[PDB]
Design a protein around this ligand. Structure first.
Ligand SMILES: Nc1ncnc2c1ncn2[C@@H]1O[C@H](COP(=O)(O)OP(=O)(O)O)[C@@H](O)[C@H]1O
Ligand SMILES: Nc1ncnc2c1ncn2[C@@H]1O[C@H](COP(=O)(O)OP(=O)(O)O)[C@@H](O)[C@H]1O
Ligand SMILES: Nc1ncnc2c1ncn2[C@@H]1O[C@H](COP(=O)(O)OP(=O)(O)O)[C@@H](O)[C@H]1O
Ligand SMILES: Nc1ncnc2c1ncn2[C@@H]1O[C@H](COP(=O)(O)OP(=O)(O)O)[C@@H](O)[C@H]1O
Lengths: 68, 67, 443, 436, 435, 445
């Protein structure tokens, strides 16, 4: 049995917490495979691995293993 | 089982995690007549079928269940 | 005919109805006081009231320590759980030794449960699914329901299933003309085999042919199950047997031991106490037997002090053959039998005594007549003198080469010359040490 | 509730104290040790006040002198909804966790958060179910008649309530409980109709139920770390939870306490046989005691001036002096013969053993001679010897028979030393042969 | 009410604007030179220019090293990161100790990012999508108690809506910047469509549909390091159950840290973020191995290291992991040469008495004067911590006999009931069998 | 970049002439003429690139400039040449052998150079019209790309249709397509279409519309070490092991095949070898097994130049029970060349302190500099270097710009060196915890 306060203040987003803001900040805006900010690293890895698309690394790094 | 009294969001999230359709479809298979229905009678091609038949094969028929 | 291995001439303690022990009864010779003490311990276990009572069997080598524990296990019967163990087995590489000790503690408390099952069974007559309106909608399966027609003896039922049950059914590879067995407690489906109402000799996949099941399709039957507490703890720690994704992927990954928390054990205790309160279950405490207890170190002993004081612990039987040795994991602690004094304070020591010439001779007689061998009297006296001179086990283990050397000369009786030949061909520890001392290059 | 056969400390129901924290000579299964019981009562009042955090109390004395019994009495007198964690010293040397991580988990398992919440429940006796199905199955209509002993009503169901009633098959005459918001239906049993068996509910059908929850800090730490599920509380493989997820829990708990949504319930962490910890564990405890979210730690040991583990010097009680500077020490003393007799009488009363007075005097005399625990262990053996002779009470001869059959430490040491050639010594030498 | 735990009478260093120390200020008594040196170190940290500065503060037990470190952390403020640590925590069974040391090094360098929060919430009144089989855009109408507002939406947010099973009449929650969609529940205007239902019913928002707010985010470099180095993969926002493989800690390469450094530098160059270096505090530093002591020399020479504070209470002691290296404070001379040493003196009688009085008056206890003199005389003969720990049993014994002032009878009773280390050792020596 | 003022950040290369003659004070290095000349010889041997597997040991007393010399070599080495700097304690892993960790450190310091030609077409999508044949086997696409200055129309193949129908663009995203190879990327969304959708979405970002020419030509030179190729060719998706370090004991067959193909690519002319330097600071705490592996691993043509630094005397080598010079076994010292550093005098200490004061933007008087030089002669050098930085803050609290003598005296009083600390411990040893744990906490007896 889990109280509603924990689930509504720590996991779900609302107006008084920054779950979604910090989630976006960690996972998109400071991701090192972002092609809008780290195009050189993506080009280097594309030459290394031979991937046809430069968005492949950003999609791979933000996908669960079973789904991949 | 994890229960939270008075919240349908918990029930929806638990049901989505326990019975996720992508992994449940991956470990199962579509019936053949159903496949013929969505391919011929509905025009859906083969390559956008959901992925199926990924469960490992048991050693015998005897090893398939605990009964 | 059968196979004999170092034991199995022992069937029990061989006591009377009042607790006194006959001298030669139950395969035992001598050791009267130890047998009577073990009978008192057996009565204490059968009383089913105490928790965490521990005794210790102390004595020299080849004195009858493990035979008494095996006799205790034979006297208690198969319905009482008995868990044999060696002290070197607690050192695992997957989990800490404390968890292994607690697992073996919980493995020695049994439980008998009268549970009930809901069963749908019969021969499959039809299998038609109904599709969904939007198969590529992302949410929801391809199908919505599956109509299943089951036919049993004097009965016919039609069932409408969700895709969840049908997924397990098609994982069982169920066709039309098979006999199935749906268990409603867990959703498990067993495919029994092809029905015998059709032709038999036109198959290529070594199937079995089953008659139609009697009774109605829907049933309720009672099954008596015998489980332990450790089975419940393991089945709850690593969940399998459900139809969800988590329990399905749990059967495919490699199993591994884990440190079971105290909270899970408390919840399992609560559920088991609720089952007992309804008059369904019944608790059967048992015996945990740790042989060669000197191999343990100080940390397992210190945890054993805590674990004996819990309110669920079984009866523990230990054995050791050290005089006054240092405890492992320490440097200066010298204690009797290699057991620290705080653990010795919680024990009840049962002493075992060495044998004589007559007891050795009749033990050799019993071991010879168990192994289907015929020994002369002079050879028997020679073997008894050999046993008193060197060792009891050396005299016991020389019976089968003597029988082979007698058989290879087309003879049934064992004579003195066979024993002399077996003395020549095979050595013992003292003569080997004598050869080792007078030798050139580290023989 | 709380299944148990007979424990070694089962006769203790708590500390025997009055309202002025003075110990009775015999109360609640505790005999003697007046100063130690008064000190433990002061410590229990300190836990009950809840304004003092991170104080360490050491219980030291000779073996088999009421040390674990005192902590058992404290844990009984604490009551429910206050966390009590009891671990041994050798339980933290894990393979998948570091020692400081296991100590942090044990520290944070003993601080609770009390949350009260409200919910709406419908619990009654099902009268009749009406479900009609169309040929196409496009819609499901239905009606549900349910009652208590005071009311009677009929409901009209939607589609998903009909689906949730078909699943978990409910017939007429059942007693069920329905949660409206979560849609969970629990079958409480069958009402009194002979044609498990539970009485019919009374009062209103719709009721408000206030549930008081008590969640430890460790559960919130496990849940808030997104790399692990809540199943790690049962499987046990949390696996070195990161440090930065604990400060968020601390700040959130402080915010909830400020807003009045929650209350902090501190508890007691009990470490038995504390001398088996390493020096690194003591150095971690020295800083973990100075935290605001720290419980009251009780440690017990019986050694005296021994070698600290992981070092090469000797220290009093096996603990270094900087840890002993942070502790207040409760000392226990050895028992008198009258207290030994009273303790043995209480233990015989627990095991429903009828003793004669002469048997009790013999047990007291041999308990003074050898040990309290040996005389405690002899009672249940002598009872079975008494049932072998088919009489109820335990006489002197049964105690003498049990004393003859089962040895003690000193007699076993004498028998070993008289015949040390037949045993395996420290050099691995033995003489198995009888002759020569 | 209020919880007091061995500290929290310490509020700061008690220094004026000229840097000198008052005698009794901020909960500190005495110790002028160490407080002034820590004030100079606080100014050096606030200057925000150096990297890899290491101060060791040393002295006997119960002299105030940990109090001084906590006073530094209170003087700096909650904006600056501060990572307390014990030397025994660097040994783990998942990674090497150098990895844990570098993680704790990077956990003490913070960031400050300005963000905004934009929220649409209310009751759905219209949900009309249009395609071209790919949906182009979705018009969603939202309603609250202060009015209504219509929105255009992305197809991905439409997929997120369709995941949550959102229909007409529910109350939803939409964040504009992130795109998160949360379904609160059905509105109470549809509460009487059936007598019994699975759906929960919630009222309308009394607020407006559109809400705007400015927030400040605080992250460290270790947070971005562990966010970019997930080995199983990026998990979902909501997952009550964990993954199928357990993810462990890994030896994070230097290339990932370099990429994170250049990304953070680019974001600093645009004025979005601000760099705040912090303090890493390692208490009981004598328990470190020689290998960690060597790796500290390399890690203190980097361009990004924080200010490191160490504490120890040892004399001429062998370093751990060696055999014959006698070194002051248990620290090898290689690390000692890179340090600055601050000494900590013991206390007098009157300083002990004033500390006992302050610890009495934080815990809301009233102490008589003769009881204070007897407690101070007891504290000079056993330890300061013994007299400080004896205040709560004295208060409990005063509360038992219905009193509010601690009298010498209660002090004598508490002295009788609870023993110190010396009397316990005296009992230990003159005893027969294991005490 | 992202950096504060480090311990030796004033050093930018070795101050040598064209004849490898060190100037007395140039490029942040003072004194040590013979060691700087020797390091210049080593630098020339690295830049030649025809000599592989050389071990150089830098030995001296502490605070002499060994890692300062290595920093100068690293700075004067230039860009795009690999320089791996590790400490001796880093090879004791839990999920890697010491041999494997040393192999991964060795192969990180030698790389290959790869150049490629890029013809990027970066712009904003206006309109994509998808047309299919009656049979459906042929797919044509009308692509209307547009930059700020101009706009043209291309015809796309069926593979472009497949690659664009995955991660679909919505007529106003910014994409760039390589003409020669066919790399497809979606940069984000234009800022001109940032106001029409009223909410962002989970996986979108706003980029500026590109200007200038639609088609651009650029060559890119890449430097790839051998360890990257080993990690990549060992698994299905290996770049996660490049960034998380979970390589886990790569086999030898892949290393042999990678060596063979690198040699044949150097033969074909596609790639050329760029060797580098491996620096092992504080080498004295390596096991004897690590020393044996280092002995055997220097005899390969794919080996860098290894530089080691030690400040030990005749100490005990770890893993054994005897003593050796520098803590290294004699067979490794046979396979080595030793550069010796010597302790400084007053003038070099004064110049180093003035350089460090200029690095930290601290103004010193003549008397303060003389007092700091005297203190650095008596005590060590790093004590005076730290005294500079704390005396700056002490003088700043006094509302003064320049550091005077009184600030240096106050910083000397407030902070102790090792000698006064040793004296103060030795005269009051009863209050500190001894080797046996004995201490006297009570102040009266
Ligand atoms: N009283 C007895 N009667 C018959 N056989 C015995 C008796 N005592 C011992 N033995 C035999 O001697 C051997 C003794 O070995 P065991 O009792 O298992 O351990 P230990 O060697 O420590 O005594 C066993 O093989 C057992 O069969
Ligand atoms: N004051 C007491 N009252 C009741 N039982 C006691 C008392 N003191 C000791 N005992 C009993 O003596 C036995 C040993 O005491 P215990 O405290 O468990 O061991 P130790 O003192 O070594 O920790 C226990 O079974 C306990 O029940
Ligand atoms: N100047 C002071 N004023 C008030 N309290 C002090 C002072 N110095 C030390 N204390 C108290 O003395 C106790 C011991 O100090 P602490 O630094 O925690 O231990 P140690 O000095 O052994 O590291 C602390 O609880 C602290 O509150
Ligand atoms: N020749 C030099 N020129 C300038 N600074 C030096 C020189 N030698 C040493 N230093 C300075 O001395 C300090 C410590 O010297 P370091 O290089 O660490 O020697 P070691 O590694 O032998 O201890 C560094 O901050 C460095 O800046």
């Amino acid at each position: 049995s889990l109280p509603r306060l924990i689930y509504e203040d720590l996991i779900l987003p609302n107006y008084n917490n920054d779950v979604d803001i910090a989630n976006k900040l960690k996972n998109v805006k400071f991701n090192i495979f972002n092609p809008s900010t780290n195009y050189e690293l993506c080009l280097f890895l594309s030459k290394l691995t031979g991937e046809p698309s430069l968005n492949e690394f950003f999609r791979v790094s933000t996908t669960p293993l079973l789904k991949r | 089982t994890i229960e939270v009294l008075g919240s349908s969001h918990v029930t929806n999230s638990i049901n989505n995690e326990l019975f996720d359709p992508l992994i449940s479809q991956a470990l199962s298979d579509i019936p053949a007549i159903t496949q013929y229905n969505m391919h011929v009678k509905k025009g859906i091609p083969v390559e956008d079928f959901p992925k199926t038949g990924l469960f490992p094969e048991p050693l015998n028929k005897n090893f398939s269940s605990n009964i | 005919v059968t196979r004999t291995a170092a034991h199995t001439h022992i069937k029990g303690l061989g006591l009377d109805e009042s607790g006194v022990a006959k001298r030669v009864e139950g395969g035992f010779v001598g050791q009267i006081e130890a047998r009577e003490a073990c009978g008192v311990i057996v009565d204490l276990i059968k009383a089913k009231k105490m928790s965490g009572r521990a005794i210790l069997l102390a004595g020299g080598p080849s004195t009858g320590k493990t035979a008494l524990a095996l006799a205790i296990s034979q006297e208690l019967g198969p319905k009482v759980p008995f868990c044999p163990l060696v002290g070197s087995e607690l050192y695992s590489v997957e989990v800490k030794k404390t968890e292994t000790l607690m697992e073996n503690f919980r493995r020695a408390i049994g439980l008998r449960i009268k549970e009930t099952k809901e069963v749908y069974e019969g021969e499959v007559t039809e299998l038609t699914p109904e599709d969904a309106e939007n198969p590529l909608g992302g949410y929801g399966k391809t199908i919505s329901h599956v109509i299943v027609g089951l036919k049993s003896a004097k009965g016919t039922k039609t069932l409408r299933l969700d895709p969840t049950i049908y997924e397990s059914i098609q994982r069982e590879k169920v066709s039309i003309g098979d006999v199935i067995y749906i268990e409603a407690n867990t959703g498990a489906v067993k495919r029994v085999g092809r029905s015998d109402a059709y032709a038999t000799e036109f198959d290529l996949e070594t199937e079995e042919y089953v008659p139609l099941p009697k009774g109605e399709v829907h049933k309720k039957k009672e099954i008596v199950q015998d489980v332990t507490l450790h089975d419940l703890d393991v089945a709850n720690a690593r969940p399998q047997g459900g139809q969800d994704v988590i329990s399905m992927m749990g059967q495919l990954l490699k199993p591994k031991k884990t440190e079971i928390t105290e909270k899970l054990r408390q919840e399992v205790n609560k559920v088991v106490a609720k089952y007992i309160d309804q008059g369904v279950a019944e608790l059967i405490p048992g015996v945990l037997f740790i042989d060669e207890v000197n191999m343990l170190d100080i940390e397992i002993f210190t945890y054993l002090n805590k674990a004996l004081e819990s309110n669920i612990a079984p009866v523990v039987v230990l054995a050791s053959n050290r005089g006054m040795t240092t405890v492992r994991g320490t440097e200066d602690v010298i204690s009797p039998h290699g057991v620290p004094p705080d653990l010795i304070d919680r024990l009840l020591i049962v002493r075992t005594l060495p044998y004589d010439k007559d007891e050795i001779r009749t033990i050799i007689e019993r071991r010879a007549t168990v192994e289907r061998l015929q020994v002369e009297s002079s050879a028997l006296d020679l073997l008894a003198t050999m046993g008193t001179e060197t060792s009891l086990r050396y005299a016991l283990q020389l019976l089968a080469p003597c029988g082979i050397l007698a058989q290879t000369s087309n003879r049934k009786e064992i004579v003195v010359n066979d024993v002399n030949e077996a003395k020549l061909l095979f050595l013992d520890a003292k003569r080997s040490t004598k050869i080792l001392e007078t030798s050139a290059n580290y023989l | 509730k709380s299944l148990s056969l007979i424990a070694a400390h089962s006769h203790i129901t708590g500390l025997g104290l009055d309202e002025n924290l003075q110990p009775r000579p015999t109360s609640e299964g505790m005999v003697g040790q007046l100063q130690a019981r008064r000190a433990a009562g002061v410590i229990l009042k300190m836990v009950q006040n809840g304004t003092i955090a991170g104080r360490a109390v050491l219980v030291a004395g000779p073996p088999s002198t009421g040390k674990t019994a005192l902590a058992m009495g404290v844990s009984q007198s604490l009551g429910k909804d206050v966390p009590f964690t009891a671990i041994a010293g050798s339980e933290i040397f894990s393979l998948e966790l570091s020692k400081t991580e296991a100590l942090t988990q044990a520290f944070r398992k003993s601080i609770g958060i009390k949350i009260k919440e409200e919910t709406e429940l419908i619990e009654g006796e099902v009268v009749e179910i009406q479900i009609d199905r169309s040929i196409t199955g496009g819609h499901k209509q239905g009606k549900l008649t349910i009652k208590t002993t005071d009311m009677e009503t009929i409901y009209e169901l939607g589609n998903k309530m009909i689906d949730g009633l078909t699943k978990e098959k409910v017939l007429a005459g059942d007693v069920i409980s329905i949660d409206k918001a979560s849609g969970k239906i629990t079958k409480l049993g069958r009402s009194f109709a002979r044609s498990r068996f539970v009485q019919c509910p009374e009062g209103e059908l719709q009721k408000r139920k206030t549930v008081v929850h008590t969640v430890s800090l460790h559960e919130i730490d496990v849940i808030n770390s997104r790399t692990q599920g809540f199943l790690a509380l049962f499987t046990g493989d949390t696996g070195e939870i990161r440090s930065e997820v604990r400060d968020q829990i601390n700040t959130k708990v402080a915010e909830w306490k400020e807003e009045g949504k929650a209350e902090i319930v501190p508890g007691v962490l009990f470490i038995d046989e504390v001398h088996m910890l390493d020096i690194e564990c003591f150095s971690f405890i020295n800083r973990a005691l100075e935290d605001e979210f720290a419980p009251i730690v009780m440690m017990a040991t019986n050694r005296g001036v021994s070698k600290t583990r992981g070092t090469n010097y000797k220290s009093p009680h096996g603990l270094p002096l900087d840890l002993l500077d942070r502790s207040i020490i409760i000392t226990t003393k050895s028992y008198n013969e009258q207290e030994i007799k009273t303790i043995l009488s209480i233990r015989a009363q627990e095991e429903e053993v009828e003793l004669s007075s002469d048997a009790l005097d013999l047990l007291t005399k041999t308990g003074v001679e050898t040990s309290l625990r040996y005389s405690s262990n002899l009672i249940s053996v002598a009872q079975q010897i008494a049932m072998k002779r088919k009489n109820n009470t335990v006489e002197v001869e049964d105690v003498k028979r049990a004393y003859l059959l089962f040895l003690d430490s000193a007699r076993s040491v004498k028998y070993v030393q008289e015949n040390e050639s037949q045993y395996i010594d420290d050099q691995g030498n033995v003489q198995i042969s009888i002759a020569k």
